[PDB]
Design a protein around this ligand. Structure first.
Ligand SMILES: *[C@@H]1O[C@H](CO)[C@@H](O[C@@H]2O[C@H](CO)[C@@H](O[C@@H]3O[C@H](CO[C@H]4O[C@H](CO)[C@@H](O)[C@H](O[C@H]5O[C@H](CO)[C@@H](O)[C@H](O)[C@@H]5O)[C@@H]4O)[C@@H](O)[C@H](O)[C@@H]3O)[C@H](O)[C@H]2NC(C)=O)[C@H](O)[C@H]1NC(C)=O
Ligand SMILES: *[C@@H]1O[C@H](CO)[C@@H](O[C@@H]2O[C@H](CO)[C@@H](O[C@@H]3O[C@H](CO)[C@@H](O)[C@H](O)[C@@H]3O)[C@H](O)[C@H]2NC(C)=O)[C@H](O)[C@H]1NC(C)=O
Ligand SMILES: *[C@@H]1O[C@H](CO)[C@@H](O[C@@H]2O[C@H](CO)[C@@H](O[C@@H]3O[C@H](CO)[C@@H](O)[C@H](O)[C@@H]3O)[C@H](O)[C@H]2NC(C)=O)[C@H](O)[C@H]1NC(C)=O
Ligand SMILES: *[C@@H]1O[C@H](CO)[C@@H](O)[C@H](O)[C@H]1NC(C)=O
Ligand SMILES: [Ca+2]
Length: 508
C-alpha cells in the first residue's frame, strides 16, 4: 500500500548533500499548512486535489549556501516529472503550483531559490545564495527530483516538464538556454529575463518621477487619468473594439500632450514635467555611450503598475543594486542613473541576464517551450518578451515558421502579471489564473499534448467568467495569438465570442 511506501522512503532515500527531514502521507482533499515558512511567504496553506507523498529535504550547496527542496509524489502517477519556480526576489516555495501539478498526476518538485523570505538580504556578501537564485536551485531540484522519483516508483520518468511565472519565467528560460537536457517541456510566463535591465528599468521610474510633491511625480489619480486617455487614443481606433483592452500594444504610440495643462496650475491635467515623465515611462531606457538597457512599459499596462511606480522607491531593485551589484547598503535609489545600469550589466552574477538567443541544443534534442506574456502586465514589460523572440530569430538564423517547431510566444490580451486583468485572462498557468482543463484552454495541458502527441498549439485560449469569478459561466473567451500574429476582430460577430476574432500575419 501507498502509506507504507511513503513512510519507509525517508530512511532509504540517501541523495548526495541532501538530508531528508521527513516523508508525509497526504490523502486527497487534505489541507496542508506551512508553519516553517517565512512570515512574508505565500501561501500559508494549500488543498491537495489527490493523494500524494510529501517529501521534504535540505540540500547543502556550498560552505554558506543551501536550498529547501520539496517533492510531492502522487499515488496515481502518470509517469511525468514536473518542476516549479519562484517569484520576484523571493525564497518561497510556490506550494499552490506544486499542488496544481500534483493534481494532474505529475511528480512535482519545488525549491526556495537558496534562501527564505521575500527579501534579498541573504544575497549580501554571499555568492552561493546568489548562485542558487540565478540557476542552481531549479537545476539541483530537477536532478535530485528525477533520482527520488526514479527510486520511489521503481521506474524512470517518461517526460520532464517545467512551469513558472515572473521570476519562474526567467528560471524556465535559464533552463532552455543553459540547461537544455533538464526539460522536454517548459512553460515560461511573464519572464523576468534581461534581469539586470529589468532591475535597471524598475529602479529608473523613481529617478524619473521623484517623490510625491515634486513636479515630475504623478499621483495614483493622475496615472489613472493617463490610462483612461490611453484607451481613448489607442483602444477602439487601433483594434475596433472598445473593451478597455489593447489587443496589440505595438501599434499604440501614446501622446500625453492631449492632457496638457491649459490652466495656471494642475488639477486634472499633465504639466510639462509630468508630460516628460509619461514619455519616459512609456519609452525605452538607454544609458552610457547610447547603450540600450530595457524597453518601455507599454501603454495600457495597469496591472502591477503601482508597485514599481508609487509613493516610495521600489524595494526589489534597490536591494538588487545594494546587495548584489554595488555590495553597499549606503547606495541611494534617489540618484539612480546610467552608471548603475552599466555596472549591473558588467557584474551580471552567474549570467542572471538570461538573454541568450542560441537555443540549438534545446531544439536538437526535441524539447518544446511555450512562452507567454500578459499585455496588461505593468510590473514586467511584455515588449521585453517580444524583443527576446526577435533576438532568438536573429541569433539562430531561423524564421518564425522554423521557430514554431520548438518555440512559440503567445501574447495574452487583457491579462496582468501572471494572474488578473480585465479580459479573457484565465489560461491555466496556475490555480489563480485557472480556466478550463483542456489542451486548447490550459497551457500546462497544451505543453503535454505538444511534447507527447505532437500537437503544436496554434493559439492558447483564455477565459473570463461572469463578474470576473473563479469559475462558472464563461462571459468572454478569446484564442490568444502567437507572435508575430495579431488578433483581429472581424467587424460583425460578438467580440466576446472566440470565432469573431482571427490571428493574422499578412504576407502578400
Ligand atoms: C560585488 O561583488 C561581486 C562578487 O560577489 C562582484 O561581481 C563580479 O563582478 C565582476 C565585474 O566587476 C565580474 O567579472 C567579469 O567577469 C567576466 C567573465 O564572465 C562573467 O560575466 C559575464 C557577464 O558578461 C557572464 O555572462 C559570465 O557567465 C558565465 O559564467 C558563470 C560563472 O562565472 C556561469 O554561471 C554562467 O552560466 C556563464 O557560463 C561570467 O560570470 C569578464 O568578461 C569581465 O572582464 C569581468 O572580469 C564577475 O563575473 C562578477 N562575479 C559575480 C559572482 O557576480 C561585483 O563586481 C562587486 N561589485 C563591486 C562594486 O564591488
Ligand atoms: C486550511 O487551513 C488554514 C489554517 O488552519 C486555514 O486558514 C485560516 O482560515 C481562516 C478562515 O477560515 C482565517 O481566518 C480569517 O483570517 C482573516 C485574515 O487574518 C480575518 O480577516 C478573518 O476575520 C478570519 O479570522 C485564518 O487567518 C487562516 N489562517 C491561516 C494561517 O492561513 C484555511 O482556511 C484552511 N482551508 C480550508 C479550505 O479549509
Ligand atoms: C527555510 O524554511 C524552511 C521551510 O520552508 C525550513 O525548513 C525546515 O527546517 C527545519 C530545521 O530548521 C526542519 O525541522 C526539522 O523537523 C524534523 C521533522 O519533524 C525533525 O526531525 C528535526 O529535528 C527538525 O526539527 C523542518 O522539517 C523544515 N521544514 C520543511 C518544510 O522543510 C528551513 O530550515 C529554513 N532555512 C533557513 C536557513 O532558515
Ligand atoms: C544555510 O545558509 C544560510 C545562509 O544563506 C546560513 O545562515 C545557514 O547557517 C545555512 N545552514 C546550514 C545548515 O548550512
Ligand atoms: Ca480593444
Amino acid at each position: 500500500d501507498f502509506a507504507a511506501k511513503c513512510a519507509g522512503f525517508k530512511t532509504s532515500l540517501k541523495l548526495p548533500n541532501t538530508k531528508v527531514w521527513f516523508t508525509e502521507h497526504v490523502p486527497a482533499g487534505k489541507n496542508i499548512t506551512f508553519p516553517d515558512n517565512h512570515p512574508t511567504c505565500t501561501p500559508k496553506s494549500t488543498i491537495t486535489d489527490v493523494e500524494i507523498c510529501r517529501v521534504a529535504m535540505f540540500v547543502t550547496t556550498g560552505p554558506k549556501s543551501n536550498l529547501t527542496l520539496e517533492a510531492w509524489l502522487p499515488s496515481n502517477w502518470t509517469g511525468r516529472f514536473l518542476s516549479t519556480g519562484n517569484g520576484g526576489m523571493a525564497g518561497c516555495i510556490q506550494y499552490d503550483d506544486v499542488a496544481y501539478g500534483a493534481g494532474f498526476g505529475f511528480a512535482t518538485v519545488g525549491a526556495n531559490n537558496g534562501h527564505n523570505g521575500t527579501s534579498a538580504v541573504s544575497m549580501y556578501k554571499n555568492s552561493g545564495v546568489v548562485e542558487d537564485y540565478v540557476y542552481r536551485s531549479v537545476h539541483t531540484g530537477t536532478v535530485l527530483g528525477k533520482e527520488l522519483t526514479k527510486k520511489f516508483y521503481g521506474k524512470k520518468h517518461t517526460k520532464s516538464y517545467y512551469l513558472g511565472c515572473s521570476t519562474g519565467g526567467r528560471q524556465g528560460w535559464k533552463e532552455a538556454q543553459s540547461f537544455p537536457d533538464d526539460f522536454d517541456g517548459i512553460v515560461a510566463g511573464a519572464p523576468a529575463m534581461r534581469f539586470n535591465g529589468l532591475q535597471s528599468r524598475s529602479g529608473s521610474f523613481w529617478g524619473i518621477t521623484g517623490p510625491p510633491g515634486a513636479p515630475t511625480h504623478l499621483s495614483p489619480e493622475e496615472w489613472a487619468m493617463v490610462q483612461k486617455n490611453v484607451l481613448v487614443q489607442c483602444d477602439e481606433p487601433l483594434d475596433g473594439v472598445a473593451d478597455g483592452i489593447l489587443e496589440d500594444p505595438n501599434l499604440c504610440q501614446y501622446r500625453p500632450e492631449a492632457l496638457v495643462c491649459s490652466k495656471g496650475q494642475t488639477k486634472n491635467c499633465l504639466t510639462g514635467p509630468q508630460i516628460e515623465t509619461v514619455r519616459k515611462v512609456f519609452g525605452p531606457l538607454y544609458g552610457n555611450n547610447g547603450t540600450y538597457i530595457y524597453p518601455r512599459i507599454p501603454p495600457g499596462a495597469d496591472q502591477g503598475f503601482g508597485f514599481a511606480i508609487g509613493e516610495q522607491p521600489f524595494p526589489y531593485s534597490t536591494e538588487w543594486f545594494q546587495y548584489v551589484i554595488w555590495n553597499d547598503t549606503k547606495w541611494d535609489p534617489n540618484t539612480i542613473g546610467p552608471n548603475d545600469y552599466q555596472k549591473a550589466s558588467e557584474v551580471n552574477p552567474f549570467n542572471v541576464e538570461t538573454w541568450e538567443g542560441d537555443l540549438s541544443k534545446f531544439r536538437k534534442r526535441g524539447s518544446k517551450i511555450i512562452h507567454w506574456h500578459g499585455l496588461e502586465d505593468g510590473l514586467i514589460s511584455s515588449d521585453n518578451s517580444m524583443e527576446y523572440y526577435n533576438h532568438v530569430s536573429a541569433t539562430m538564423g531561423l524564421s518564425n515558421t522554423e521557430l514554431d517547431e520548438f518555440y512559440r510566444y503567445f501574447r495574452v490580451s487583457g491579462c496582468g502579471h501572471c494572474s488578473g486583468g480585465i479580459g479573457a485572462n484565465r489560461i491555466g498557468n496556475n490555480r489563480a489564473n485557472l480556466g478550463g482543463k483542456e489542451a486548447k484552454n490550459n497551457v500546462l495541458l497544451a505543453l503535454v499534448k505538444w511534447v507527447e502527441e505532437g500537437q503544436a498549439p496554434e493559439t492558447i485560449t483564455g477565459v473570463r467568467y461572469v463578474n470576473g469569478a473563479t469559475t462558472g459561466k464563461v462571459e468572454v473567451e478569446r484564442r490568444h495569438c502567437r507572435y508575430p500574429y495579431r488578433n483581429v476582430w472581424d467587424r460583425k460577430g460578438n467580440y466576446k465570442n472566440p470565432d469573431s476574432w482571427k490571428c493574422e500575419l499578412p504576407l502578400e
